[PDB]
Amino acid sequence: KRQVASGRAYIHASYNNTIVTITDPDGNPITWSSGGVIGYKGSRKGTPYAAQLAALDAAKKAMAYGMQSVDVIVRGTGAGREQAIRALQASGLQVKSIVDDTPVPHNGCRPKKKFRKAS
Amino acid sequence: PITKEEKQKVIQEFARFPGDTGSTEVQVALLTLRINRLSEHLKVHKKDHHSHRGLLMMVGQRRRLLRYLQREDPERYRALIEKLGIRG
Amino acid sequence: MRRYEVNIVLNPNLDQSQLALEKEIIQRALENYGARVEKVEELGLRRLAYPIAKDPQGYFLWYQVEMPEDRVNDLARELRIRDNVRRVMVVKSQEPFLANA
Amino acid sequence: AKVKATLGEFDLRDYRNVEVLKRFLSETGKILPRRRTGLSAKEQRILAKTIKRARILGLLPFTEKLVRK
Amino acid sequence: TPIRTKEILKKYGFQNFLIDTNILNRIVDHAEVTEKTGVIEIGPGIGALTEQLAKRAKKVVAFEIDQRLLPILKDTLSPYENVTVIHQDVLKADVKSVIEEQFQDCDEIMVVANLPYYVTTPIIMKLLEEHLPLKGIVVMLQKEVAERMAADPSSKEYGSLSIAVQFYTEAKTVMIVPKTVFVPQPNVDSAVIRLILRDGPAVDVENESFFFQLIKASFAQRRKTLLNNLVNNLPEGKAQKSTIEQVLEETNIDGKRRGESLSIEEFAALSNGLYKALF
RNA sequence: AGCUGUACCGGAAGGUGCGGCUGG
RNA sequence: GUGGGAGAGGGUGGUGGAAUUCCCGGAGUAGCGGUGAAAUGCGCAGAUACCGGGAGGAACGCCGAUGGCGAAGGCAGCCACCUGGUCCACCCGUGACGCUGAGGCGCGAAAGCGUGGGGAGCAAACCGGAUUACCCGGGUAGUCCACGCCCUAAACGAUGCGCGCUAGGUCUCUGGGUCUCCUGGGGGCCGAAGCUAACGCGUUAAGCGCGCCGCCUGGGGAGUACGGCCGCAAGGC
């Protein structure tokens, strides 16, 4: 439909889930997939295998909208990071750049109790 | 801050003899200058609890020097105290 | 009565007229506060490592000035009122600490 | 190696000399430790101050993106 | 029994115990149970208390909630006949019916229990809520809590439990249990308290809902001026501030008084005052 | 892993909040 | 006194970016979130993930250290002003002007209180979900600011302050010089003599001495009782 043929991918990698969002150069998302969309529920969503299937599914959909190559941006440090990158790399899209964009505070808001105690 | 000029004029005014920088009078005068400046500062800055200690120490040192001066020669003590306007 | 460096980063999209007017106004304001200019350096246009006011370009002016201390803050407050000027920084003129020599 | 060794003579207090200052920042816009820069503490202190100053002036990046896996 | 405890546990392949004898008699001594008075025990456990209780008890009803401990109740209480076990949770049961049924022939009942403290307070509160016609209650209940149950109107104990119980019954600390008597030392001291019910409420029954609501409101921020407590916690009350200021005058209660320093009488007066005046 | 100042506790065999200590 | 040096020492103004939350606009659809595993919860009134703009509060990543400063408490973005303490060199001035200190006076983390603001995140009490606490989702005080109270601690190096003498070795922060080295001041480890019940201390003494202050006299009852002083109260002495 859009027939952009060249976009980018945002891989939000969490400890509980991985979400892959394909988007135009302009940043407007075109399609998305996650661990839950495949059919996994609970902890299974966090597994690297879930990340692989999420990446493959999102890529297949994006191809259906006619993309050919993306520029992958990865956020977070979950368990599906490398697996998702690898899955998207060989999915058929010609990935050009891989960029780490983990958003970290400059000692801003106070974290939750579980994440405190840090020196 | 106290510029070199301000200090020098006080030193050369209160000196017993030319080239004197260390008599009790000179010390008292310099401490008085510092105390006046710091008092103005603290009057402006009420919550500067860390400089108040400096002021107390300065006042103590001045009082000790004045006690010694009064014990040694009362006349010089009286002259200094009147000319500096201390305790009045 | 001390030596300061005044850095102005202002709107790069100013033509000759507007830029001249801005330079003139900041010069007048600088002179107004008993400041005396030792030298001026015009670095022109530079590439900002991040956008400022959505614009990735900045016009850089650097003045070495000698002025009364108790005025300096006010001067900054005076120089930061124009909408054309983006960044104003006043720093005490230090010494060039040299290492690796 | 060391950043100091991989450099000629320069001033540490120059908060506009971007071409040399960029040498003291990692891939991400972060100040390198003494382990890497190879400076004495006084030097490191002055350098960090200057880096922060230049950061404010917009000449040096606060943060950026590493182009790798 | 310390020597027998190990034998009984080992004989079945097997938690805090009053192993020692003299004090188990003292607690029922304070409980004052005779051939005239029956007993409802909710925490019989192995039945250590039940044996010495039934040695001088009219009627014995025991509540066990876990049937894992059930097989050992019968054989450990073989000689005794007064024992009747209702394998029911007292909270989920209807104690009124059991009062009407088992102790119909018997004269009076005074509840004596020894159960974990995380279960204690809700049970006592329920037994008080439903207005059962029973004489009294005797429980050892984590001394630090018992003091709060008694809690003269000051000294960090007078809270909200104090007001509830003193509105329902009388309370006073009866016995202190020295630590380490239990085989596992509980790192904390316990106290046997007794509750004795009364004929009707201690004070005005004008509005139970609003009375308890005010009690809860006045103790939300314990460290706080009572007026501040009311303007904060009481529903809206921000726009009704002037009303509160008005009503506090004629009740002869000062605004800056830290409600933790009030009596049940004063609380009842304020409950009546605000109601029919606030709205 | 505990301990401690303070403040609460109507699922206190004790728990939690904000700080501190190693006497882990 | 003159010349110079380092520093999250303190107060007052002012601005820089990252991040969380929320609001608006765009694009897109079925889950998101959370756990040991799940549930409560949020979402078809369009949630999550993405891009752009705006609002506000709080804290300052990298450097950052076994580091630095202060009498302790404690003190980290950056700029400016005001200001305290301290080190070194020259060995210029006064000529014992010194040390300690019962009372007094001032300062004093956090948690609390009063009078007004403020409120993004977190979070006692409380409300729900799983499984006795724990853990999960919400949530008032509080955390922030101004002024005025409170005056406590594992307020600790569990080591009062000052001065003199008694082997060294090594690491480090910061001055000076005649710069392989030498000479000051801080912070750490290992160890002579010595001390200690032992552990351990050991030029930063817990060694050998002198001066002044504070405190101890078996445990529990008990920091309780009464009295007095202070506090709005909790409570403190």
Curated annotation (Swiss-Prot), chain A:
Coiled-coil annotated residue ranges, if any: none
GO cellular component, one term: ribonucleoprotein complex
Keywords tagged on the record: Ribonucleoprotein, Ribosomal protein, RNA-binding, rRNA-binding
One of the GO biological process terms: translation
Bias (Basic residues): 109-119
InterPro entries (UniProt xref): Ribosomal_uS11, Ribosomal_uS11_bac-type, Ribosomal_uS11_CS, Ribosomal_uS11_sf
Gene Ontology MF terms: rRNA binding; structural constituent of ribosome
Disordered: annotated span: 99-119
Pfam families, A to Z: Ribosomal_S11 (PF00411)
Keyword Methyltransferase: no
Family matches, as HAMAP family: Ribosomal_uS11 (MF_01310)
UniProt function note: Located on the upper part of the platform of the 30S subunit, where it bridges several disparate RNA helices of the 16S rRNA. Forms part of the Shine-Dalgarno cleft in the 70S ribosome, where it interacts both with the Shine-Dalgarno helix and mRNA.
Sequence similarity: Belongs to the universal ribosomal protein uS11 family.
Subunit structure: Part of the 30S ribosomal subunit. Interacts with proteins S7 and S18. Binds to the C-terminus of IF-3; however exactly how IF-3 interacts with the 30S subunit is unclear. May contact the C-terminus of Era.
Name of the protein in its database record: Small ribosomal subunit protein uS11
Upper lineage: Bacteria, Thermotogati, Deinococcota, Deinococci, Thermales
Swiss-Prot record, chain B:
GO MF assignments: rRNA binding; structural constituent of ribosome
Source domain of life: Bacteria
GO biological process: translation
Matches recorded under Pfam families: Ribosomal_S15
A GO CC term assigned to this protein in UniProt: cytosolic small ribosomal subunit
Swiss-Prot/TrEMBL keywords: Ribonucleoprotein, Ribosomal protein, RNA-binding, rRNA-binding
Described function: One of the primary rRNA binding proteins, it binds directly to 16S rRNA where it helps nucleate assembly of the platform of the 30S subunit by binding and bridging several RNA helices of the 16S rRNA. Forms an intersubunit bridge (bridge B4) with the 23S rRNA of the 50S subunit in the ribosome.
Protein family according to the UniProt entry: Belongs to the universal ribosomal protein uS15 family.
Oligomer status and interactors: Part of the 30S ribosomal subunit. Forms a bridge to the 50S subunit in the 70S ribosome, contacting the 23S rRNA.
Protein's name in the database: Small ribosomal subunit protein uS15
Organism: Thermus thermophilus (strain ATCC 27634 / DSM 579 / HB8)
Higher taxonomy: Bacteria, Thermotogati, Deinococcota, Deinococci, Thermales
UniProtKB/Swiss-Prot annotation, chain C:
Homology family: Belongs to the bacterial ribosomal protein bS6 family.
CDD domains: bS6
GO cellular component: cytoplasm; ribonucleoprotein complex; ribosome
Residues forming coiled coils: none
Alphabetized InterPro entries for the sequence: Ribosomal_bS6, Ribosomal_bS6_CS, Ribosomal_bS6_sf, Ribosomal_S6_plastid/chlpt, Transl_elong_EF1B/ribsomal_bS6
Transmembrane helix among keywords: no
The keyword Cell membrane appears for this protein: no
A single MF term (Gene Ontology): structural constituent of ribosome
Subunit and interaction comment: Part of the 30S ribosomal subunit. Forms a tight heterodimer with protein bS18. May make transient contacts with protein uL2 of the 50S subunit during translation.
GO BP term (any one): translation
Role noted for this protein: Located on the outer edge of the platform on the body of the 30S subunit.
Protein name: Small ribosomal subunit protein bS6
Organism: Thermus thermophilus (strain ATCC 27634 / DSM 579 / HB8)
This protein's UniProt keywords: Ribonucleoprotein, Ribosomal protein, RNA-binding, rRNA-binding
Curated annotation (Swiss-Prot), chain E:
Name of a matching Pfam family: RrnaAD
GO biological process terms held by the UniProt record: rRNA methylation
Matching InterPro entries: KsgA/Erm, rRNA_Ade_diMease-like_C, rRNA_Ade_Mease_Trfase_CS, rRNA_Ade_methylase_Trfase_N, rRNA_adenine_dimethylase, SAM-dependent_MTases_sf
Binding residues annotated for S-adenosyl-L-methionine, in chain numbering: 16, 18, 43, 64, 89, 114
Top EC class, one word: transferase
Record's catalysed reaction(s): adenosine(1518)/adenosine(1519) in 16S rRNA + 4 S-adenosyl-L-methionine = N(6)-dimethyladenosine(1518)/N(6)-dimethyladenosine(1519) in 16S rRNA + 4 S-adenosyl-L-homocysteine + 4 H(+)
Presence of keyword Methyltransferase: yes
Recorded coiled-coil stretches: none
Entry's localization field: Cytoplasm
Predominant localisation class: cytoplasm
Cellular component GO terms, alphabetical: cytosol
CDD domains on file: AdoMet_MTases
Alphabetical keyword list: Cytoplasm, Methyltransferase, RNA-binding, rRNA processing, S-adenosyl-L-methionine, Transferase
EC number: 2.1.1.182
PANTHER family, alphabetized: DIMETHYLADENOSINE TRANSFERASE (PTHR11727), DIMETHYLADENOSINE TRANSFERASE-RELATED (PTHR11727:SF7)
This protein's name: Ribosomal RNA small subunit methyltransferase A
Native species: Bacillus subtilis (strain 168)
Taxonomic lineage from the root: Bacteria, Bacillati, Bacillota, Bacilli, Bacillales
